[PDB]
Amino acid sequence: MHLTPEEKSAVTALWGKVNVDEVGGEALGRLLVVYPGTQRFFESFGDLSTPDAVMGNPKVKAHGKKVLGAFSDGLAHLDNLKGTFATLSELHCDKLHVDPENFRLLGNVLVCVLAHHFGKEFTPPVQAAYQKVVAGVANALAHKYH
Amino acid sequence: MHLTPEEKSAVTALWGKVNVDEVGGEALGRLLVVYPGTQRFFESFGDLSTPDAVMGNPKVKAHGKKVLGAFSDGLAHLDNLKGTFATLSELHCDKLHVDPENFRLLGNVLVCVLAHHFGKEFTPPVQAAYQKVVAGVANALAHKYH
Amino acid sequence: VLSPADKTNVKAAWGKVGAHAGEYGAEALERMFLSFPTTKTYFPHFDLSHGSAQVKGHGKKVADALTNAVAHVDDMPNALSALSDLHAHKLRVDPVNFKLLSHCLLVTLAAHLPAEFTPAVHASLDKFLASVSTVLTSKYR
Amino acid sequence: VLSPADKTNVKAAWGKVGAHAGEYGAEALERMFLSFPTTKTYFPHFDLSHGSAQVKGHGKKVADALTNAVAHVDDMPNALSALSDLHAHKLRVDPVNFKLLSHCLLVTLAAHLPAEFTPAVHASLDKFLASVSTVLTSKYR
Ligand code: HEM
C-alpha cells in the first residue's frame, strides 16, 4: 500500500461525496450482470436472470450496502488493511469458499461505477489512486486463505 | 517472506545440493524454448534458432549461472528481498524494459528444473515452499517499476 | 461469444462515441500508463507525458482499429489479422496487459457516456473487448 | 497452436506415463492444493488431507480425461465438449486456476520422467495443457 499523501487526499476527497447506499447496490449488481459466474455465490438472492431482475433486487441492494460499508471501514484504516479485514478474510475463505480472484473483479467494477458517477472528476491520477486501494483491499481479503 | 521455519529449512537443505552450472543453464535455456517470446531480450546472445542451439549456447549458460547467483543471494536474505533485489529491479525496468509477468514464467520454469533434477526428493511440501520463494523474488524484482 | 443483442449494444455504444473516439483511445492509454505502470515497458521509444502527441496519435490508431472491428463484428479474426501478428509475434505483448487496456477503455467510456453505459451495455462491451483481446493474443507465447 | 511435432511429442510422453497416469493425476492435485491454497475453494466437499481417497479418485478422473484428449488431439473441442460445459457453466472455475494445475502437472511429469522431459517435449506439453485449458474455459463468464 504505497499511497503518497496526495493519493490519500484524492481518494478521501472523492469518497466523501459517495452515496454508499446506492453505489454498493450498483457495484454488486453490475458484478453479477457483467460476470455471471459470480452468481454461484448468491443463489439465495432469488431471481437474477436478467439485468433488471438483478439491479432492482432488494437483496442485492442491501448486500451491496454491507459490502461498501466494509469498504468504507478500510478507507479509514489504509495503513492497516490486513488487520481490519482479517475476520472477513477467514469468513470468505472458510465459510463462503470464494476464490479470491473474484475480489479483483469486484474491485474493477467499482472503479467503473465510480467513473460512471463522477464523469470528468474521475481523472487518470484519481483512478490510479483507487486502483492501488482496490488492489490493497483485495490482497487483504486474500491474506488469511489457507 | 512468510516462510515457516520448517519451510526455510526445506528450501535451504535442497539448495545446498544444487549444481548451479547445470540448473542455471537449464532454467534459462528452457525459458527461451518453452516461451519463445522471451527471446526478444537476448538477441545479443546469438543463435536461438532451435532447442539444441539454445541449450548449447555458452552465453545462455553463463547468464543462467548469474541468474541463479542472484537467487542464492535472496535465499540468504529472505527477510529483506526488496532491499536485496532493488538494483536488479531498476535495471529490469529502466534499462531492459521487461514486463514483470515474465518473472513468474522464469520462476515456474525454475521449479520444473528442480523437480526434473531431484525427482522424488522434490515432494509436494518442498514444492510449496519453493513456490513461495519464487513468488517473493518475482514480487521483489517488480517492486521498483515506475 | 457475441450474441445478437451484444452486437446491437456494441454498435449503438460505439455509434455514440463517434468523432470523439481518437480522444477516448488517447485517454484510455493515459489511464493505463498511470494506473498500471508495468505497461510502459512496451513503449520506451515513446514520449509518455500528459498531452503527448505521440500518445494522442497512438490513441487514434487504437480507436480506428476498434471501429474496424465493430464494422466487421462477424469476421473479427480475419479483420484484425494483421494486428494479431503484430501484437503476438512481432511485439510479444503479454496477455494480462490486454485486460488492463480493456478495463481502462471501459472506465473511459463510463466517464464520458453516462446515459448509454447501462449494465447490459457494460456487459456487452466487456464481452466485445475480451473477444478482441483473444484475437490479438491467440498466437502468443 | 499445436503443430504435428507437438502432437508427436505429446503422444510420446503420455504413452510412457501409461499406467501411472492415475497416480500422477493425484500427485498433481495434491501439489496444486499445497502450493496454491486458493484452489481448495472449489472442492469444499472433499477430504483434502494427505492420502485422501477422494483426491486419488479424482486423480484418475483428471488423468483419464487427458488420456482422452491426447487421443483426440485433432478435435479436442468436440471430445472435451462435456467437460467444457461442466467447468465453464456449472462449476465456473476462474481461468487462472487452469495455469496452476497445468504447472503442477508439468512438475509431476518432470519429477517422474527425467529422460523424457526434454526442453522440446516440455514446450509441447506446455502448449498442450494450455489448449486443453482454453477449451475447458471457453464460455467462462
Ligand atoms: C470488497 C470485497 C468484498 C467485501 C468487502 C465483502 C464484504 C462482505 C460482507 C461484509 C459480508 C457480510 C459478512 C457476514 O455475513 O458476516 C459478505 C458476505 C458475503 N460475501 Fe463478500 N465481500 C466482498 C467480495 C465478495 C465477492 C467478490 C464475493 C463473491 C463473488 C463475495 C461473496 C460473499 C457471500 C456469498 C456472502 C454471504 C452472503 C449471504 O448473506 O448470503 N464477497 N461479504
Ligand code: HEM
Ligand atoms: C527470476 C527473475 C530474474 C532475475 C533474478 C534476473 C537476474 C538478472 C541478473 C543478475 C542480471 C545481470 C545484471 C547485470 O548486467 O549486471 C540480469 C540481466 C538481464 N536480465 Fe534478468 N533476471 C530475471 C528474469 C529475467 C527475465 C524473465 C528476463 C526476460 C525475459 C530477463 C532479462 C534480462 C536481460 C535482457 C538482462 C541483460 C542481459 C545481458 O547481459 O545482455 N531477466 N538479470
Ligand code: HEM
Ligand atoms: C484493444 C486492444 C489493442 C488494440 C486494438 C491495439 C491496436 C494497435 C494498433 C492499431 C497499432 C498500430 C499498428 C501500426 O501503426 O502499425 C498498435 C501498435 C502497438 N500496440 Fe497495440 N493494441 C491493443 C492493445 C495493446 C496493448 C495491451 C499493448 C501493450 C500494453 C499494446 C502495445 C502496442 C505497441 C508497443 C505497438 C507499437 C507502437 C509503435 O511502436 O508505434 N497494444 N496497436
Ligand code: HEM
Ligand atoms: C487439465 C485441466 C482439467 C481437467 C482435464 C479436468 C477434468 C475434470 C474431470 C474429468 C472431472 C470429472 C467430471 C465427471 O464427474 O465426469 C472434473 C471435475 C471437477 N473439476 Fe476439473 N479438470 C481440470 C481442471 C480443473 C481446475 C483448474 C479446477 C479448479 C481448480 C477444477 C475443478 C473441478 C471441480 C471442482 C470438479 C467437480 C468435482 C466433484 O464435484 O466431485 N478442474 N474435472
